[PDB]
């Protein structure tokens, strides 16, 4: 197991939308809800950890377009700033979210302030929603439904969606969904690699991906740095590949921290992790018809649980990237990634396989010389 490398003979795919085969909805749609006993309208400690108040004195993300490659984004009063980017599941415009996830992610990135303590990181940014996946759907033809087959199908649409996002003018491309494969069964991803390279270099997009959560295949943390000469981050020891995070250097892979900046218990360790952001007790926008604030989803036997995960951490980082690109519009994607990582809270330590350079620091990123 070694860091992946593009095959220069393999072209990026087209950005055509649509599923590879017809899909059918297998599970009822879900909306995010308010967890009883909470006050979602209070300013989240996650915002305070990031000092978004301080950041907004430098930038609110004006002029930036962020693509949300996710489960769709439901427009509403807190998300009036969402553009259709299409659908790889059905034939919608990307503005239907049957899962809640894309909406929560979009809200963190560029949700609007309102009559409460909630705001997106970059509320003056514009969003493009591309629905690239949904676990509520499966192929209409009930064929092989294996981890391998699902993962390959997911990579195939992800690569197209990345090209589509870049070609639609996205400056930041957010990939909060994660697919993992065991290392002994990771197949050629040359097309996905080609797509990510196209978007990151030729189209100069900052691509941000969630690192994954422990427990395709179930994601599992990889062994930590082990002092191997020439392999300080322990690529050699990887057993569980997080996609597209492992596609360094094109993708900034984001781990989750608690509100104090410590690695979240569930954050997936890997040698690709570059940075972190808050991933616990998330409050964002709902895909329910009112489009208000939510902070929970149903778990077993329909009991509500908080929103947690690296998906939300990635979203925060995408929002911060939009702030940085608005303030410094001439920086390349590589320069923007360098700025984010070199100013993160743990940048002066060797990178962590849990949190990379540590929790993103928006004000530091916006003021560093």
Catalytic residues: 70, 101, 311
Contact 321, 340 (CB under 8 A): yes
The strand pairing partners of 139, in sequence order, are: 23
Residues 6 or more apart in contact with residue 333 via CB below 8 angstroms:
200, 201, 204, 205, 206, 207
Strand partners, 277: 256
Name the token pair of 338: 């360098």
The residue range among 21-29, 40-48, 56-64, 193-201 that interacts with Cl ion, by the rule CB under 5 A, is 40-48
Question: In the 3-class helix/strand/coil scheme, how is 276-314 assigned residue by residue?
Answer: EEECCCECEECCCCCCCEECEEECHHHCEEEECCHHHHH
CA-to-CA separations, 72 to 38, 133, 224, 311, in angstroms, rounded: 26, 8, 34, 14
Other Cβ atoms less than 10 A from the Cβ of 304: the count is: 17
The per-residue DSSP string of 55-107 comes to HHTT---TT-EEEEEES----BTTB--EEEEEESSSSS-S---SSSHHHHHHH
Cα 315 to Cα 168: distance, rounded to the nearest angstrom: 19
**Closer to Cl ion at the Cβ: 52 or 200?**
52
User: Cα–Cα distance between 91 and 36 in angstroms, integer?
Assistant: 36
Shortest spacing between CB 55 and Cl ion, in angstroms: 8
- Residues 167-186 close enough to bind Cl ion by CB under 5 A: none
Q: Alpha-carbon distance 284 to 294, whole Å?
A: 6
Residue 19 beta carbon to Cl ion: minimum distance, rounded to whole angstroms: 41
**Window of 30-38, 49-57, 199-207, 283-291 that interacts with Cl ion by CB under 5 A:** 49-57
Residues in 225-264 that interact with Cl ion by CB under 5 A: none
Work out how close the CB of 54 gets to Cl ion at its nearest, in angstroms, rounded to a whole number: 7
Q: How many CB atoms lie within 10 A of CB 6?
A: 19
Distance between CA atoms of residues 360 and 90, nearest Å? 35
51 vs 190 by CB, closer to Cl ion:
51
Least Å distance, CB 357 to Cl ion, is 21
Cβ proximity to Cl ion, 24 vs 48, nearer residue: 48
Number of residues that bind Cl ion (CB under 5 A): 5
Stretch that binds Cl ion, among 9-17, 46-54, 138-146, 209-217 (CB under 5 A): 46-54
**Between residues 53 and 146, which has the closer beta carbon with respect to Cl ion?**
53
Stretch that binds Cl ion, among 52-60, 89-97, 251-259, 336-344 (CB under 5 A): 52-60
**Residue 367 interacting with Cl ion (CB under 5 A):** no
Q: Judged by CB under 5 A, does residue 53 bind Cl ion?
A: yes
Task: Give the nearest distance from C-beta 39 to Cl ion in angstroms.
Answer: 17
Task: State which residue has the least CB distance to Cl ion.
Answer: 53
User: Closer CB to Cl ion, residue 47 or residue 345?
Assistant: 47
Evaluate the omega torsion of the peptide bond into residue 244 and state whether it is cis, within 30 degrees of 0: yes
Nearer of residues 175 and 320 to Cl ion, judged by Cβ = 320
- For Cl ion, the closer of residues 44 and 65 by Cβ is 44
Q: Does 57 bind Cl ion (CB under 5 A)?
A: no
Q: Which of 23, 30, 52, 122 binds Cl ion (CB under 5 A)?
A: 52
Stretch touching Cl ion by CB under 5 A, among 47-55, 118-126, 172-180, 239-247: 47-55
Cα 256–259–263 angle (5° rounding)?
Answer: 35
Residues that bind Cl ion (CB under 5 A): 47-48, 51-53
């Amino acid at each position: 197991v070694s860091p992946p490398q593009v095959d220069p003979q393999i072209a990026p795919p087209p950005g055509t939308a649509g599923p590879a085969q017809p899909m059918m909805q297998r599970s009822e749609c879900i909306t995010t809800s308010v967890l009883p006993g909470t006050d979602p309208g209070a300013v989240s400690p996650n915002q305070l950890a990031l000092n978004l108040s301080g950041a907004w004195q430098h930038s609110r993300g004006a002029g930036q377009t962020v693509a949300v490659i996710d489960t769709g984004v439901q427009p509403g009063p807190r998300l009036p700033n969402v553009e259709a980017g299409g659908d790889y599941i059905e034939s919608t415009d990307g503005l239907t979210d049957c899962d809640g996830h894309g909406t929560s992610v979009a809200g963190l990135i560029a949700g609007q302030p309102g009559p409460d303590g909630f705001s997106g990181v970059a509320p003056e940014a514009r969003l493009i929603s591309i629905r690239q996946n949904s676990p509520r759907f499966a192929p209409r033809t009930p064929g092989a439904d294996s981890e391998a087959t699902r993962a390959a199908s997911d990579a195939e649409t992800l690569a197209r969606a990345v090209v589509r996002a870049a070609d639609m003018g996205a400056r930041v491309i957010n990939i909060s969904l994660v697919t993992c494969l065991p290392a002994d069964r990771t197949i050629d991803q040359s097309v996905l690699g080609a797509a990510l390279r196209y978007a990151a270099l030729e189209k100069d997009a900052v691509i941000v991906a969630a690192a994954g959560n422990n427990r395709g295949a179930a994601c599992e943390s990889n062994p930590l740095p082990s002092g191997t000469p020439g392999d300080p981050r322990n690529w050699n020891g990887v057993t569980s590949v997080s996609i597209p995070s492992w596609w360094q250097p094109y993708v900034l892979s984001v781990g989750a921290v608690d509100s104090t900046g410590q690695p979240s218990s569930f954050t997936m360790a890997g040698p690709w992790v570059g940075i972190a952001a808050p991933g616990e007790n998330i409050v964002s926008v709902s895909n329910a018809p009112d489009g208000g604030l939510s902070n929970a989803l149903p778990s077993e036997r329909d009991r509500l649980v908080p929103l947690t995960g690296t998906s939300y951490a990635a979203a925060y980082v995408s929002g911060v990237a939009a702030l940085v690109r608005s303030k410094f519009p001439d920086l390349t994607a590589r320069q923007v990634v360098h700025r984010l990582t070199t100013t993160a809270q743990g940048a002066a330590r060797s990178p962590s396989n849990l949190i990379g350079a540590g929790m993103v620091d928006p004000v530091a990123a916006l003021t560093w010389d």
